[PDB]
Ligand binder design. Structure first.
Ligand SMILES: *[C@@H]1O[C@H](CO)[C@@H](O[C@@H]2O[C@H](CO[C@H]3O[C@H](CO)[C@@H](O)[C@H](O)[C@@H]3O)[C@@H](O[C@H]3O[C@H](CO)[C@@H](O)[C@H](O)[C@@H]3O)[C@H](O[C@@H]3O[C@H](CS(=O)(=O)O)[C@@H](O[C@@H]4O[C@H](CO)[C@@H](O)[C@H](O)[C@H]4O)[C@H](O)[C@H]3O)[C@H]2NC(C)=O)[C@H](O)[C@H]1NC(C)=O
Ligand SMILES: *[C@@H]1O[C@H](CO)[C@@H](O[C@@H]2O[C@H](CO[C@H]3O[C@H](CO)[C@@H](O)[C@H](O)[C@@H]3O)[C@@H](O[C@H]3O[C@H](CO)[C@@H](O)[C@H](O)[C@@H]3O)[C@H](O[C@@H]3O[C@H](CS(=O)(=O)O)[C@@H](O[C@@H]4O[C@H](CO)[C@@H](O)[C@H](O)[C@H]4O)[C@H](O)[C@H]3O)[C@H]2NC(C)=O)[C@H](O)[C@H]1NC(C)=O
Ligand SMILES: *[C@@H]1O[C@H](CO)[C@@H](O[C@@H]2O[C@H](CO[C@H]3O[C@H](CO)[C@@H](O)[C@H](O)[C@@H]3O)[C@@H](O[C@H]3O[C@H](CO)[C@@H](O)[C@H](O)[C@@H]3O)[C@H](O[C@@H]3O[C@H](CS(=O)(=O)O)[C@@H](O)[C@H](O)[C@H]3O)[C@H]2NC(C)=O)[C@H](O)[C@H]1NC(C)=O
Ligand SMILES: *[C@@H]1O[C@H](CO)[C@@H](O[C@@H]2O[C@H](CO[C@H]3O[C@H](CO)[C@@H](O)[C@H](O)[C@@H]3O)[C@@H](O)[C@H](O[C@@H]3O[C@H](CS(=O)(=O)O)[C@@H](O)[C@H](O)[C@H]3O)[C@H]2NC(C)=O)[C@H](O)[C@H]1NC(C)=O
Ligand SMILES: *[C@@H]1O[C@H](CO)[C@@H](O[C@@H]2O[C@H](CO[C@H]3O[C@H](CO)[C@@H](O)[C@H](O)[C@@H]3O)[C@@H](O)[C@H](O[C@@H]3O[C@H](CS(=O)(=O)O)[C@@H](O)[C@H](O)[C@H]3O)[C@H]2NC(C)=O)[C@H](O)[C@H]1NC(C)=O
Ligand SMILES: *[C@@H]1O[C@H](CO)[C@@H](O[C@@H]2O[C@H](CO[C@H]3O[C@H](CO)[C@@H](O)[C@H](O)[C@@H]3O)[C@@H](O)[C@H](O[C@@H]3O[C@H](CS(=O)(=O)O)[C@@H](O)[C@H](O)[C@H]3O)[C@H]2NC(C)=O)[C@H](O)[C@H]1NC(C)=O
Ligand SMILES: *[C@@H]1O[C@H](CO)[C@@H](O[C@@H]2O[C@H](CO)[C@@H](O)[C@H](O[C@@H]3O[C@H](CS(=O)(=O)O)[C@@H](O)[C@H](O)[C@H]3O)[C@H]2NC(C)=O)[C@H](O)[C@H]1NC(C)=O
Ligand SMILES: *[C@@H]1O[C@H](CO)[C@@H](O[C@@H]2O[C@H](CO)[C@@H](O)[C@H](O[C@@H]3O[C@H](CS(=O)(=O)O)[C@@H](O)[C@H](O)[C@H]3O)[C@H]2NC(C)=O)[C@H](O)[C@H]1NC(C)=O
Ligand SMILES: *[C@@H]1O[C@H](CO)[C@@H](O[C@@H]2O[C@H](CO[C@H]3O[C@H](CO)[C@@H](O)[C@H](O)[C@@H]3O)[C@@H](O)[C@H](O)[C@H]2NC(C)=O)[C@H](O)[C@H]1NC(C)=O
Ligand SMILES: *[C@@H]1O[C@H](CO)[C@@H](O[C@@H]2O[C@H](CO[C@H]3O[C@H](CO)[C@@H](O)[C@H](O)[C@@H]3O)[C@@H](O)[C@H](O)[C@H]2NC(C)=O)[C@H](O)[C@H]1NC(C)=O
Ligand SMILES: *[C@@H]1O[C@H](CO)[C@@H](O[C@@H]2O[C@H](CO)[C@@H](O)[C@H](O)[C@H]2NC(C)=O)[C@H](O)[C@H]1NC(C)=O
Ligand SMILES: *[C@@H]1O[C@H](CO)[C@@H](O[C@@H]2O[C@H](CO)[C@@H](O)[C@H](O)[C@H]2NC(C)=O)[C@H](O)[C@H]1NC(C)=O
Ligand SMILES: *[C@@H]1O[C@H](CO)[C@@H](O[C@@H]2O[C@H](CO)[C@@H](O)[C@H](O)[C@H]2NC(C)=O)[C@H](O)[C@H]1NC(C)=O
Ligand SMILES: *[C@@H]1O[C@H](CO)[C@@H](O)[C@H](O)[C@H]1NC(C)=O
Length: 1040
């Protein structure tokens, strides 16, 4: 039982799952373990308990939560069914609320109920009236008493009517049924009873939940206050970036356990877009080609080459010594035509260059001028047609001879020196639709919570409408015409004789960067001029989307034909006409994000609607969820730092990168993978994305939703793992071929996700580091993706949704010198390294510390940011941290020092020498300074003896003005400094103390004890770190 039921309390539970008798059954229970009961008085205890139960029944509007009717009821004094179980020590009763068992009783096998009341397999329950029985019967709802009235519930009452009619009620009226209960407090047997149940839901339609988030979706990052202006509206205007997951909750009362859900997303942009389109192929009748022209075949991103298509009556095309055999044939009303496909290029070749798999030509039917079509086939009726190559050195000219109907024609191609690219540019009202699926489980039915992708890696269909227009002159014997389409594509017709056809047409592909050559649409338009009662010039046209894969250009589907007609009763005349036209492109999977950015469908204006389908039960959502798209530029920042940030081991510099577009999964450390399959939706099977949580990539089979579906072994599993070397890097491990199928939150690898084409990533985003003057960089040319485990910070407890991500990534930088030249096994510690999750360490020599610098360049991870902010440069952000110069000092405590005292301290001070205690500087030779710091550690490496400076001179100027310079020798030092070592005085305050000794100085000079020695002492030290030369002086004093 979940939840458990307290001493002397009441609770209610819904009967569900496999083998459940019927819908709308609830079991009420009261805990009676607190007292003793016997066969003598069991009927008294059940009587006492069941007398005190009160039940409330409501109806509500499923979206708003508004109550629409309420009744409150009580068990009768006789004729009800209620039981006692000796084993579990509980009294229990079952009520049936919904159709058909509203007025009649239903029987519940005791095998089933044992899920909730396990005692029932051990002993049969006590009945009312003290008997024992093998089977349980419901008390029906329509038998209970209205507390308002003192009578049995009215058959006419609206709540009872509703519950009895729930089937049509829920769907049509968005009505939802809810029940709760309470036990009116009483004392029995020296114990007391009190409680109120949680409420329970009998039925509800399948909807997006609309409380409190009115839009049905939400983005945790916006609800917590982290998105600025956009946090004012998180309850009714959700936004998300390109490739990320947005959260959602569905209410589902039909489901049991886990359910696969399928989703459909429709995107729209206000107002039309201007589209740029490149000519893949050009097909004409031999009569329509111009006399002489220059041509050279273009080569597209996917390797395919443009081709030139001649249609002719002649069984070969002839060109002197060379003859061309036709790629295919077709027939119209017994007349037979041949189709020749050529690539103009390098050298005459006898084998196919590439292929085209189906191709539809449309023509006006002779009878009715309605459109009809045929697919061109090979001479053995196979569909795939081959393309051949002709050509030679530039400026070579080739004459091709053919026939159109009765008449011979000759055409003269010049082989160009540079590829012919024709661009057409038009305005079109674009829209796109996409599909996706996920497997979802719950612990709080009927609420199912999940998240869906913003843009999926499926096929996506881009679609939109446009206009074609025709202009023309008709005469007694022949007709002339031109057409415009796609704004500035132009086709022309040489004068068409009566009863003759003529063809022209073009194939385009999208003329953007990488998606070129991957997909297409083809239009071919046939014309016919004939005499009826009237002179009629008619056009008919095909419309087919096409895709290229493995060098076959193939038809995906055919949409409907279109036609236009120009009519003249007069013999000479001039005319015009128009028709709508349609356009459709199917993206190939890997290209699908790129498409949406380039055509302009994703951007700050885009708006998206979502519907959802239950794969177990065959139901669709009766309401829709909504969200809006956004693109946001990155930012870099630092908290203000002084020199203090670089002294002792626990001091570092923090940089914050703000980049929300890098956060693909709302939960930090969350991970998912993705593949493409057929998905069940509606009553159809459609190519779509399946999202799988975790870190393993699958190549599945069958259809998602049905029983065929099987994900095999993990092809690869990606993991961050520790590695050897100093510190210990954590870096990504796994087969790099599959990175375009894995998502994380780490910007050092998120750039691959849906942004890899032909096996190279489009945008070399992420974080890049250069360092100076010790030259190093990450990533180096050899370095893997995912060179460090950088992850975003979590929202804390005062926020509405804790534990969720935030757009801040916090990155720690250490620069240090004290562990330079340390060794860790085979490793020598010098340069730039990664440590832990979010840390970099740079170790530089003593002479290079001040002025060292690190420059961080962060480049956006998302292709939308690169596209919208290319010109302004707001796609990269830079920052530098660098070590500032600082003033050291050397000083005797006082200007005058007495000769009476044996030792007079000389203190040195320099911030960057400081460390944890103990630390000491030793002196030797010609005054060379050695620094030691045994307790110093940084991520496991410990400090080495450093050589940091020297005492430069010591001199005394005497009372007669003579100046003596004391020579620094290993023997002289030991007298002047009885301890050759100076200690640090306090932690991280670099201030060292030395004991220059007057008792030594006298003997070292051989000068008369005091009588001569009214003198000025002078001392000097040079440090390598800054480069400064410090000096200190004192007047030696006695009675003079
Ligand atoms: C593919 O195969 C094609 C079909 O056979 C070849 O086409 C033929 O190309 C000839 C040029 O090719 C030669 O030169 C290039 C260097 O530029 C080499 O790479 C080639 O290997 C080859 O040696 C072309 O000849 C014309 O250009 C020549 C320049 O070298 C020159 O002889 C003339 O200027 C030619 O006009 C062919 O075009 C036809 O040529 C004949 C003459 S012939 O066949 O060359 O002997 C002409 O007939 C003449 O017309 C004139 C009118 O002024 C009369 O005075 C004369 O009595 C009569 O002979 C035709 O007018 C002319 O069209 C051309 N053949 C055709 C018809 O297509 C092609 O080279 C191969 N391509 C490669 C390199 O892969
Ligand atoms: C928005 O909707 C998101 C859906 O993507 C929710 O993300 C899911 O978050 C889970 C943690 O969230 C919990 O805690 C937060 C507070 O921080 C609450 O707001 C939430 O209500 C919730 O209580 C996370 O579950 C995992 O972490 C849990 C520890 O908190 C742990 O109990 C679980 O056992 C999970 O490991 C989901 O993260 C992923 O979970 C899947 C498993 S499952 O999806 O939970 O079933 C893991 O995949 C597995 O990986 C192993 C590798 O060892 C494989 O062997 C196995 O094949 C594979 O199943 C992932 O490793 C793990 O990252 C997380 N879902 C995803 C896909 O990221 C988010 O919470 C929702 N927001 C709100 C506010 O509710
Ligand atoms: C349909 O209308 C379109 C109007 O946008 C035309 O597209 C634009 O065409 C410009 C002219 O070049 C065209 O003529 C070629 C030679 O016959 C032919 O191969 C193509 O049809 C080709 O598009 C084109 O200019 C380019 O070429 C010029 C000539 O070499 C050169 O001077 C330019 O620098 C440029 O490379 C347009 O591209 C844009 O041109 C701008 C200057 S201007 O030439 O338009 O005055 C330039 O500032 C800009 O950077 C550049 O993008 C091209 N426009 C676009 C966006 O595609 C199209 O040709 C018309 N279709 C037909 C029937 O040909
Ligand atoms: C009626 O009342 C008593 C008091 O409320 C209560 O017993 C307490 O609950 C369970 C036993 O019953 C539950 O668990 C079993 C499965 O183990 C199921 O079959 C039952 O249907 C119940 O769900 C014991 O766990 C309690 O002992 C204590 O439990 C604490 C957690 S709790 O959430 O379960 O209460 C632990 O922290 C303690 O360490 C542990 O001692 C027991 N409480 C006591 C001390 O009496 C029953 O739930 C109710 N009666 C029955 C039999 O259902
Ligand atoms: C279909 O695909 C090919 C291959 O990707 C593409 O060629 C690449 O075009 C870019 C620029 O694209 C724009 O200009 C051309 C005209 O030059 C237009 O046709 C396009 O519509 C675009 O407006 C060329 O610059 C590429 O050359 C490369 O430039 C790179 C820098 S970039 O930022 O400019 O891209 C360098 O890093 C490369 O070293 C250099 O090769 C060119 N790429 C290649 C590999 O040749 C076609 O233009 C596309 N054509 C169609 C039908 O649009
Ligand atoms: C910090 O960096 C300084 C400045 O670059 C460097 O000083 C250089 O000292 C070396 C000798 O140091 C070696 O011995 C001591 C033992 O006392 C060790 O602690 C060190 O680890 C070294 O093994 C001197 O050779 C340099 O003096 C000059 O060298 C020039 C050539 S160079 O290529 O060596 O620089 C000559 O042309 C000059 O005539 C000579 O004066 C000295 N470098 C300079 C330019 O002053 C320290 O060793 C580094 N200190 C530590 C320990 O990190
Ligand atoms: C799509 O719309 C976004 C929302 O306006 C644009 O994002 C804004 O980008 C600009 C810089 O170009 C910047 O002003 C915003 O940064 C925030 O500014 C806020 C001030 S206010 O605008 O709310 O008054 C600050 O409160 C906040 O700390 C800054 O982070 C930025 N807005 C957001 C959401 O961060 C985006 O530029 C635009 N994209 C396109 C296609 O141009
Ligand atoms: C372009 O020409 C193709 C042949 O050059 C045509 O292919 C023929 O199509 C017919 C009808 O679809 C098909 O039955 C032929 O297959 C042959 O059938 C022969 C008997 S009969 O049909 O001639 O009576 C048999 O000998 C044998 O089964 C097949 O060889 C097929 N002909 C060949 C030679 O393959 C094609 O229809 C035409 N394309 C269009 C669209 O006009
Ligand atoms: C587009 O043309 C392709 C020719 O390369 C062809 O793809 C190959 O198909 C084979 C098996 O198909 C046989 O039949 C075709 C007839 O077009 C032959 O050309 C081919 O050699 C085979 O005998 C298969 O091994 C593989 O998918 C492709 N071969 C290669 C080079 O790997 C396609 O059949 C055709 N259209 C489509 C996609 O149906
Ligand atoms: C940190 O500031 C110091 C104090 O101003 C400064 O040392 C003093 O200035 C000069 C040194 O200038 C020479 O040295 C530099 C660095 O090698 C060279 O660019 C060039 O040869 C300069 O002429 C020195 O003579 C003077 O004694 C120093 N003053 C004191 C107080 O003793 C440092 O130069 C400075 N460090 C850096 C790298 O910025
Ligand atoms: C019903 O009868 C049983 C006895 O058969 C009761 O148990 C006794 O209760 C008294 C006080 O209530 C206790 O002092 C005894 O220890 C119990 N005797 C036995 C035989 O166990 C039980 O409590 C009775 N229930 C009610 C509600 O009266
Ligand atoms: C989302 O786009 C889909 C296009 O796939 C649309 O659903 C189609 O609805 C039309 C009638 O409007 C029917 O001809 C088709 O049966 C539907 N298509 C499919 C494949 O099921 C619809 O226009 C858009 N739906 C929304 C949410 O507005
Ligand atoms: C196109 O030219 C071809 C040349 O092959 C002509 O084909 C003729 O076809 C008819 C059958 O209708 C036969 O009687 C002749 O034997 C063929 N003539 C020749 C010379 O081969 C045909 O005349 C022309 N087609 C059109 C549409 O005018
Ligand atoms: C100190 O200077 C003397 C004299 O120039 C020289 O002999 C000696 O090698 C120097 N010692 C060191 C190690 O600094």
């Amino acid at each position: 039982l979940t939840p458990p039921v307290s001493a002397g309390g009441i609770q209610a539970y819904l009967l569900t799952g496999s083998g459940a008798p019927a819908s709308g059954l609830v079991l009420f229970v009261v805990n009676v373990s607190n007292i003793q009961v016997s066969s003598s008085n069991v009927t008294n205890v059940i009587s006492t308990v069941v007398s005190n139960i009160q039940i409330n029944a409501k109806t509500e509007n499923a979206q708003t939560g508004a109550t629409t009717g309420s009744v409150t009821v009580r068990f009768p004094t006789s004729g009800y069914n209620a039981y006692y179980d000796s084993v579990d020590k509980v009294v229990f009763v079952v009520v049936s609320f919904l159709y058909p068992y509203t007025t009649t009783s239903v029987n519940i096998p005791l095998s089933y109920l044992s899920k909730y009341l396990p005692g029932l397999l051990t002993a049969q329950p006590y009945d009312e009236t003290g008997a024992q029985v093998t089977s349980v019967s419901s008390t029906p709802f329509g038998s209970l008493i209205d507390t308002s009235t003192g009578q049995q519930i009215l058959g006419t009452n609206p709540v009872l009517t509703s519950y009895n009619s729930y089937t049509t009620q829920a769907n049509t009226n968005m009505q939802e049924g809810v029940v709760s209960g309470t036990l009116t407090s009483f004392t029995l047997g020296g114990q007391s009873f009190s409680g109120s149940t949680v409420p329970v839901i009998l039925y509800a339609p399948f909807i997006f939940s609309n409380s409190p988030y009115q839009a049905g979706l939400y983005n945790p990052m916006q609800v917590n206050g982290n998105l600025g202006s956009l946090s004012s509206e998180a309850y009714y205007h959700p936004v998300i970036w390109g490739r990320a997951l947005i959260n959602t909750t569905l209410i589902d009362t039909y489901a049991s356990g886990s359910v696969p859900f399928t989703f459909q997303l429709n995107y729209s942009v206000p107002g039309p877009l201007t589209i740029n389109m490149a000519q893949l192929a050009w097909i004409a009748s031999i009569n329509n080609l111009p006399t002489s022209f220059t041509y050279l075949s273009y080569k597209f991103s996917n390797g395919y080459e443009s081709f030139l298509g001649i249609i002719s009556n002649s069984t070969q095309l002839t060109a002197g010594a060379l003859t061309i055999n036709p790629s295919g044939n077709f027939t119209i009303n017994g007349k037979k035509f041949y189709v020749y496909l050529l690539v103009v290029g390098s050298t005459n070749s006898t084998t196919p260059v590439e292929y085209v798999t189906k191709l539809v030509v449309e023509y006006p039917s002779s009878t009715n001028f309605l459109p009809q079509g045929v697919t061109v086939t090979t001479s053995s009726n196979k569909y795939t047609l081959p393309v051949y190559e002709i050509g030679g050195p530039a400026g070579t000219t080739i004459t091709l001879t053919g026939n159109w109907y009765s008449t011979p024609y000759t055409v003269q191609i010049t082989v160009g020196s540079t590829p012919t690219l024709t661009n057409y540019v038009s305005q079109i009202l674009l829209k796109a639709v996409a599909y996706e699926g996920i497997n979802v489980s719950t612990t709080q039915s009927p609420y199912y919570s999940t998240a869906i992708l913003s843009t999926p890696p499926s096929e996506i269909s881009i679609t939109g409408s446009s206009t074609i227009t025709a202009q023309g002159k008709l005469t007694a014997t022949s007709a002339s015409a031109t057409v415009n389409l796609l704004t500035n594509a132009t086709l022309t017709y040489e004068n068409i004789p009566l009863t003759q056809y003529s063809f022209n047409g073009i194939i385009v592909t999208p003329g953007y960067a990488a998606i070129n050559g991957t997909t297409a649409m083809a239009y071919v338009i046939g014309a016919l001029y004939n005499k009826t009662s009237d002179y009629v010039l008619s056009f008919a046209g095909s419309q087919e989307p096409m895709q290229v894969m493995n060098n076959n250009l193939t038809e995906v589907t055919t949409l409907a034909p279109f036609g236009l007609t120009l009519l003249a009763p007069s013999v000479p005349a001039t005319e015009t006409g128009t028709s709508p036209l349609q356009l459709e492109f199917f993206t190939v999977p890997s290209t699908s994000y790129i498409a949406l950015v380039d055509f302009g469908l994703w951007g700050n204006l885009t708006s998206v609607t979502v519907s959802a389908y239950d794969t177990v039960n065959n139901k669709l959502s009766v309401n829709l969820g909504y969200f809006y798209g956004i693109v946001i530029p990155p930012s870099i920042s630092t908290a203000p730092y002084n020199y203090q940030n670089f002294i002792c081991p626990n001091n570092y510099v923090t940089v914050t990168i703000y980049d929300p577009d890098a956060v693909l999964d709302p939960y930090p450390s969350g991970s998912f993978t993705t593949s493409s399959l057929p998905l069940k939706y509606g009553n159809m099977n459609i190519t779509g994305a399946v999202i799988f949580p975790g870190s393993s990539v699958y190549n599945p089979s069958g259809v998602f939703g049905y029983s065929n579906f099987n994900k095999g072994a993990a092809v690869t599993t990606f993991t961050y793992t520790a590695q050897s070397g100093p510190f210990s890097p954590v870096a990504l491990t796994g087969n790099t071929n599959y990175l375009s199928q894995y998502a994380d939150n780490n910007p050092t690898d998120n750039y691959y996700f849906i942004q890899t084409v032909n096996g190279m990533p489009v945008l070399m985003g992420g974080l890049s580091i250069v360092a100076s003057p010790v030259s190093a960089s990450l990533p180096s040319s050899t370095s893997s993706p995912g060179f460090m485990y950088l992850l975003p910070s979590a929202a804390q407890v005062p926020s509405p949704l804790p534990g969720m991500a935030t757009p801040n990534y916090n990155l720690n930088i250490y620069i240090t010198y004290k562990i330079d030249g340390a060794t860790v096994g085979n490793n020598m510690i010098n340069g730039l390294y990664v440590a832990s999750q979010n840390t970099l360490i740079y170790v530089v020599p003593n002479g290079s510390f001040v002025g060292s610098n690190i420059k961080l360049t962060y480049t956006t991870t998302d292709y939308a940011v690169l596209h919208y902010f290319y010109s302004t440069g707001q796609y990269k952000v830079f920052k530098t941290v660098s070590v500032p110069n600082v003033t050291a000092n050397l000083y005797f405590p006082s200007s005058t020092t007495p000769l009476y005292q044996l030792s007079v301290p000389l203190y040195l001070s320099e911030p960057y020498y400081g460390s944890p205690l103990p630390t000491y500087i030793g002196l030797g030779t010609n005054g060379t300074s050695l620094w030691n710091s045994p307790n110093y550690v940084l991520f496991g490496v410990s400090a080495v003896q450093q050589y940091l400076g020297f005492i430069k001179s010591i001199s005394v100027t005497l009372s007669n003005g003579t100046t003596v310079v004391i020579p620094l020798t290993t023997s002289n030092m030991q007298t002047l400094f009885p301890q050759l070592v100076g200690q640090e005085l306090q932690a991280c305050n670099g201030t060292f103390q030395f004991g220059i000794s007057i008792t030594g100085l006298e003997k070292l000079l051989n000068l008369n004890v005091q009588q001569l020695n009214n003198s000025i002492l002078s001392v000097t030290y040079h440090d390598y770190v800054t480069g400064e030369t410090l000096t200190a002086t004192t007047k030696l004093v006695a009675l003079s």
